[PDB]
Amino acid sequence: VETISFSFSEFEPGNNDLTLQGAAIITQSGVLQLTKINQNGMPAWDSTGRTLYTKPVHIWDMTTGTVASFETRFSFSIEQPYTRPLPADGLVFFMGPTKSKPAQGYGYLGVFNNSKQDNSYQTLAVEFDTFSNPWDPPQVPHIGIDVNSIRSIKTQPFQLDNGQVANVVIKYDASSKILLAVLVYPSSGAIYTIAEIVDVKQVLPEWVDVGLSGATGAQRDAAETHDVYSWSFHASLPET
Amino acid sequence: VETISFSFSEFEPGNNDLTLQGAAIITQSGVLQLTKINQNGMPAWDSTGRTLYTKPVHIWDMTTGTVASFETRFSFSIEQPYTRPLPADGLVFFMGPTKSKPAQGYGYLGVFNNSKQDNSYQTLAVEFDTFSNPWDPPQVPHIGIDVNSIRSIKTQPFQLDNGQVANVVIKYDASSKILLAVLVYPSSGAIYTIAEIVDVKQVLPEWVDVGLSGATGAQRDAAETHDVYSWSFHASLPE
Ligand SMILES: OC[C@H]1O[C@@H](O[C@H]2[C@H](O)[C@@H](O)[C@H](O)O[C@@H]2CO)[C@H](O)[C@@H](O)[C@H]1O
Ligand SMILES: OC[C@H]1O[C@@H](O[C@H]2[C@H](O)[C@@H](O)[C@H](O)O[C@@H]2CO)[C@H](O)[C@@H](O)[C@H]1O
Ligand SMILES: [Ca+2]
Ligand SMILES: [Ca+2]
Ligand SMILES: [Mn+2]
Ligand SMILES: [Mn+2]
């Protein structure tokens, strides 16, 4: 069996196991600010940032046909400071081709480049979407399972608890092909779930980079924070 | 679209929407005690109790082939008072033939009668198992998805936070045939998940009863509480 795992109880500046891209920075306090926080302490619009684990993950093997099961957990907080304009745009956990650089921002969350479901993306992602674009369901925010497209194969509306910490658990079982995501707000006790069938060997390349990405809006003050406090990941590829 | 739903923020003695069976009692305080609590305040062993919603649920229609999606949520607490003997046996959310009575207790949790996987059970259940029987994985407690058998098709170990309230969410999506269960302990923030493919059309009858069941052990003091504080359910059958 081939396994890989990491766990950051808090983010460590300078720890090379993580790569920061775009606007992403890690504070001395250990918080990953995916999108820029201005000097005044407020979230900047037109910002896109990501972080990738620096070691590629072997998600499946074409020769043996084996597929890995994996799990990832993280705690994040989104703070929407203004009543108007509408906040944006969201944050997301993604898995895709190695050596990737940030893609388009805004509604594409730094992961996609359009609203097409293109197999060439070879990307799987679980989004926490705060702005309703033309391809989105009207309810925001919502959790979404994205398979080679920003247009989610399934969505689940959830109520934001402004500025509070949400705990996320995402798990993929290769035998059942079930991808599940759960969001819990300790503050209110709210629990949300979403799941769908995803055959990773039909979507992802054999080796992938895993990461987190966040993006704020296309107009002044159409923004919110996209802070992450912790992040763990584990994958196991059976020999079979 | 045929829908049904209910929500008990707490339980009230006498409410006809719930049928109590076996040892099950609803306290004046609004707590559903699935298994007997002795007058000394401790859980009694050799106890089995359940509750069934008095309304029948239309889970699927053979004529149209339509299948319902559903979700249930409940809060419970299991308190294991002694270091020995080992605590037992657990509690479970189950769906199956209407107007049923309590099955075997102990490890069968008041839902099954043996450890065989018999289509005749026509029962789907999500267990919160506290005692490792011969047909069980070694670690306890564990969540388990049971399809016509107490020998779950999928299990997930979880740490008990003794006497604390656990929040459970069980959801079935008919389109994907995914049955998922989540357990969260607000006290510690711990989150556990389990999911598996279940084609309810192959397991359950068209109309089913939904309920909760709990059981304590076969030897003196091999027991624990099986208290439920709230329970909600919702199902929707397209067509
Ligand atoms: O407002 C946040 C929202 O902006 C969308 O882009 C808008 C832009 O803000 C508006 O000024 C312009 O007139 O139209 C654009 C749409 O074509 C983003 O697309 C959306 O993702 C959010 O970022
Ligand atoms: O001890 C709790 C445990 O008991 C099992 O039954 C035992 C019984 O307790 C023991 O005294 C007897 O000698 O053997 C029985 C089984 O081999 C139950 O089966 C189990 O579910 C728990 O309730
Ligand atoms: Ca969006
Ligand atoms: Ca057992
Ligand atoms: Mn979306
Ligand atoms: Mn079991």
Task: Tell me, letter by letter, the H, E, C secondary structure of B152-198.
Answer: CCEEEECCCCCCCEEEEEEEEECCCCEEEEEEEECCCCEEEEEEEEC
Instruction: Determine if ligand 1 sits within 6 Å of the CB of residue A218.
Output: yes
Cα angle value B230/A143/B188 (rounded, 5°):
45
Convert A214-233 into a string of H (helix), E (strand) and C (coil).
EEECCCCCCCCCCEEEEEEE
Closest protein CA for atom 13 of ligand 1: A219
Q: Is A209 annotated as a binding residue?
A: no
Instruction: Determine if ligand 1 sits within 6 Å of the CB of residue A219.
Output: yes
How far is the C-alpha of A23 from the C-alpha of A35, rounded, in Å? 6
How far is the C-alpha of B67 from the C-alpha of B181, rounded, in Å? 19
Q: Would the CB atoms of A178 and B193 count as touching at under 8 Å?
A: no
The SS3 assignment for B130 reads coil
A119: exposed, middle or buried (Cβ count in 10 Å: 0-12, 13-18, 19+): exposed
Neighbours of ion ligand 6 (CB under 5 A): B 129, 136, 144
How far is the C-alpha of A3 from the C-alpha of A25, rounded, in Å? 28
How far is the C-alpha of A45 from the C-alpha of B139, rounded, in Å? 49
Q: Would the CB atoms of B197 and A178 count as touching at under 8 Å?
A: yes
Instruction: Determine if ligand 2 sits within 6 Å of the CB of residue B140.
Output: no
Instruction: Determine if ligand 1 sits within 6 Å of the CB of residue A85.
Output: yes
Question: By what technique were these coordinates determined?
Answer: X-ray
DSSP string, A84-117: SSPP-EEEEEEEE-TT------GGGTTT-SSSS-
User: Residue B7's domain spans which residues?
Assistant: 1-239
**CA B78 / ligand 6 centre spacing (Å):** 16
Q: What is the CATH number of the domain that holds B99?
A: 2.60.120.200
The SS3 assignment for B120 reads helix
**CA B107 / ligand 4 centre spacing (Å):** 5
CB B207 within 8 A of CB B122: no
CB A48 within 8 A of CB A215: yes
Closest chain A residue to B197, measured at CA:
A176
Q: If you ran DSSP here, which 8-state letter would residue A132 be given? A: -
Chain A residues with beta carbon closer than 8 angstroms to that of B73: 191
CB A35 within 8 A of CB A225: yes
CB B21 within 8 A of CB B111: no
Q: Which residues are registered as beta bridge partners of B180?
A: B171, B195
- B-interface mutation test, from A155, A185, A191, A230, most B Cβ less than 10 A away: A191
Place of tokens 């059309």: B201
Cα→Cα distances A221→A22, A37, A112, Å: 19, 12, 23
Instruction: Determine if ligand 2 sits within 6 Å of the CB of residue B96.
Output: no
Q: How far is CA A125 from the centre of its chain?
A: 6
The SS3 assignment for B48 reads strand
Q: If you ran DSSP here, which 8-state letter would residue B224 be given? A: -
Instruction: Determine if ligand 2 sits within 6 Å of the CB of residue B5.
Output: no
CB B149 within 8 A of CB B142: no
Q: Which two tokens stand for residue A4?
A: 């890989």
Please tell me chain B's helix, strand, coil percentages from 3-state DSSP, rounded to the nearest 5.
5, 45, 50
Closest chain B residue to A187, measured at CA:
B186
CB B162 within 8 A of CB B80: yes
How far is the C-alpha of B82 from the C-alpha of A1, rounded, in Å? 40
Q: What is the number of structural domains in chain B?
A: 1
How many CB atoms neighbour CB A16 within 10 A? 7
Q: If you ran DSSP here, which 8-state letter would residue B43 be given? A: B
Instruction: Determine if ligand 2 sits within 6 Å of the CB of residue B153.
Output: no
Q: Which residues contact A40 (CB under 8 A, 6 or more apart)?
A: none
Q: Which residues contact B224 (CB under 8 A, 6 or more apart)?
A: B43, B78, B79, B80, B81, B87, B88, B130, B216
Q: Would the CB atoms of B184 and A184 count as touching at under 8 Å?
A: yes
Q: Which helix (H) or strand (E) holds B72?
A: strand B69-77
- Resolution to 1 decimal, in Å? 1.7
Place of tokens 């650089």: A101
A151: exposed, middle or buried (Cβ count in 10 Å: 0-12, 13-18, 19+): middle
Closest protein CA for atom 4 of ligand 2: B218
What b/e string do you get for A72-95 counting C-beta neighbours within 10 Å, with b at 16 or more? Answer: bbbbbbbbbeeeeebbbbbbbbbb
First to last CA, chain B: 5
Q: Which two tokens stand for residue B90?
A: 């657990």
The SS3 assignment for B108 reads helix
Q: Is the dihedral of CA B134, B136, B141, B145 positive or negative?
A: negative
How far is the C-alpha of B136 from the C-alpha of A139, rounded, in Å? 42
Q: Would the CB atoms of A180 and B184 count as touching at under 8 Å?
A: no
How far is the C-alpha of B198 from the C-alpha of B128, rounded, in Å? 18
Q: Which residues are registered as beta bridge partners of A169?
A: A73, A182
Q: Which helix (H) or strand (E) holds A203?
A: helix A200-203
Q: How far is CA A218 from the centre of its chain?
A: 20
How far is the C-alpha of A176 from the C-alpha of A179, rounded, in Å? 9
Place of tokens 């994958």: A235
**CA B215 / ligand 2 centre spacing (Å):** 12
Annotated binding site of B for Mn(2+): 127, 129, 136, 142
Chain A residues with beta carbon closer than 8 angstroms to that of B193: 169, 171, 180, 182
Q: Which helix (H) or strand (E) holds B201?
A: helix B200-203
Q: Is A131 annotated as a binding residue?
A: yes
- A-interface mutation test, from B171, B178, B187, B230, most A Cβ less than 10 A away: B178
Q: Which residues contact B138 (CB under 8 A, 6 or more apart)?
A: B132
